[PDB]
Amino acid sequence: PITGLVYDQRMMLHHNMWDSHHPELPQRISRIFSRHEELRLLSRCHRIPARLATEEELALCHSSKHISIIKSSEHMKPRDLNRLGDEYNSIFISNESYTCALLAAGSCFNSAQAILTGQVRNAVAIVRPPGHHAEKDTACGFCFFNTAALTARYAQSITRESLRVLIVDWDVHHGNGTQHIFEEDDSVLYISLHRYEDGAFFPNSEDANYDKVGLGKGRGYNVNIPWNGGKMGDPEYMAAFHHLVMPIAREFAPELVLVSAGFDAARGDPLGGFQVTPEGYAHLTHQLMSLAAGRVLIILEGGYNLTSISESMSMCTSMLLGDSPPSLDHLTPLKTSATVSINNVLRAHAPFWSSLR
Numbered sequence: 001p002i003t004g005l006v007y008d009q010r011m012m013l014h015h016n017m018w019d020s021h022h023p024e025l026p027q028r029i030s031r032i033f034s035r036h037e038e039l040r041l042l043s044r045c046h047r048i049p050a051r052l053a054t055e056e057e058l059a060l061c062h063s064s065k066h067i068s069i070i071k072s073s074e075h076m077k078p079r080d081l082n083r084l085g086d087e088y089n090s091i092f093i094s095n096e097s098y099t100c101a102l103l104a105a106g107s108c109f110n111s112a113q114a115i116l117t118g119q120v121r122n123a124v125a126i127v128r129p130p131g132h133h134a135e136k137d138t139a140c141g142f143c144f145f146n147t148a149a150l151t152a153r154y155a156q157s158i159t160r161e162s163l164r165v166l167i168v169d170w171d172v173h174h175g176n177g178t179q180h181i182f183e184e185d186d187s188v189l190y191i192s193l194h195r196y197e198d199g200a201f202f203p204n205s206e207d208a209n210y211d212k213v214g215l216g217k218g219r220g221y222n223v224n225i226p227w228n229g230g231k232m233g234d235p236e237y238m239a240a241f242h243h244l245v246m247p248i249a250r251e252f253a254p255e256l257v258l259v260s261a262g263f264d265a266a267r268g269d270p271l272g273g274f275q276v277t278p279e280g281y282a283h284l285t286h287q288l289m290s291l292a293a294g295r296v297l298i299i300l301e302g303g304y305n306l307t308s309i310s311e312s313m314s315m316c317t318s319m320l321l322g323d324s325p326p327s328l329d330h331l332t333p334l335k336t337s338a339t340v341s342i343n344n345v346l347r348a349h350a351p352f353w354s355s356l357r
């Protein structure tokens with residue numbers, strides 16, 4: 001098989017003991033995996049085994065203090081789990097959360113290894129809890145360790161320190177943790193599309209705005225594409241890819257592409273409120289496959305409509321397997337505010353990318 005797939009039902013054991021209906025559900029990953037079986041995608045893929053991340057691998061991006069505190073939760077009494085989660089913005093913790101965060105990260109390291117050793121061309125990782133809100137020193141927004149950031153540092157640790165890694169973050173939320181981890185880094189190009197609403201959308205920081213371009217040698221290697229005032233869908237995401245993501249990505253010439261693949265911008269997602277279709281995600285996937293000689297690892301982030309995330313991620317795997325990509329309407333006019341967002345990002349990044357000049 002050209003396409004790898006990682007999935008381990010052990011990542012279901014992370015659970016919310018005070019709200020069993022919290023939308024970051026165990027069954028997010030089992031529903032996506034079941035859909036792969038139903039569509040006969042699983043048997044077309046090379047199965048890659050999950051493993052635990054080591055504490056040494058977590059230290060690629062996270063402080064010893066942060067690793068120690070989350071690790072300390074694995075044997076905590078429920079009262080202590082509840083108090084610990086309450087130290088963070090939007091975290092719940094069970095005795096299994098630490099192990100599950102380790103399995104998500106190690107599953108993606110096994111997937112990046114399979115790509116870079118040439119065992120597979122591309123790969124999908126059906127993992128939880130998600131990662132992109134996780135900072136060097138703290139948990140945030142259902143995320144303990146930053147799986148995608150760790151995977152980029154893991155890839156560099158088995159090739160070269162300056163291996164060009166593109167991270168495309170199409171989850172409807174800003175990956176604040178990913179941006180912060182790589183803010184001063186020109187080896188990892190971070191591109192995020194996210195609902196912003198002038199800071200009313202989680203995680204509610206001006207850090208997500210189009211003028212955050214990177215710091216020092218990192219100037220130009222942080223691309224925020226913020227959506228305001230507007231139910232955004234395939235036309236706006238396609239336009240963002242045409243005008244910003246693909247020109248910048250081709251100029252950067254990545255050696256590995258990681259997708260922070262939240263499916264919470266999907267039609268029917270109750271937290272994202274957007275209308276990206278399964279064919280939209282297939283189109284974005286096929287665009288990214290034109291990069292890095294096709295070396296693309298798709299990492300699950302958010303996505304809360306169980307049916308929508310199952311169908312949407314299955315259509316990404318379908319594209320990685322070389323199935324015929326969709327032909328979508330590039331002439332549909334955009335929401336007026338999306339044109340404004342794209343022009344704001346172009347203005348901010350034209351100093352850094354000759355492809356935008």
Ligand SMILES: NCc1ccc(NC(=O)N(CCCCO)Cc2ccc(C(=O)NO)cc2)cc1
Nearest residue numbers: 021022023090141142171173202264271302303
């Ligand atoms: N029980 C139903 C329920 C619970 C929570 C939410 N939404 C939130 O908890 N979040 C948004 C508001 C935070 C406090 O103002 C947190 C959140 C939402 C989405 C994501 C994500 O997928 N990002 O990648 C992360 C954190 C809705 C319904």
Ligand SMILES: [Cl-]
Nearest residue numbers: 040041042043
């Ligand atoms: Cl199958």
Ligand SMILES: [K+]
Nearest residue numbers: 169171173193
């Ligand atoms: K994003």
Ligand SMILES: [K+]
Nearest residue numbers: 182185188221
């Ligand atoms: K960067």
Ligand SMILES: [Zn+2]
Nearest residue numbers: 171173264302
């Ligand atoms: Zn999200």
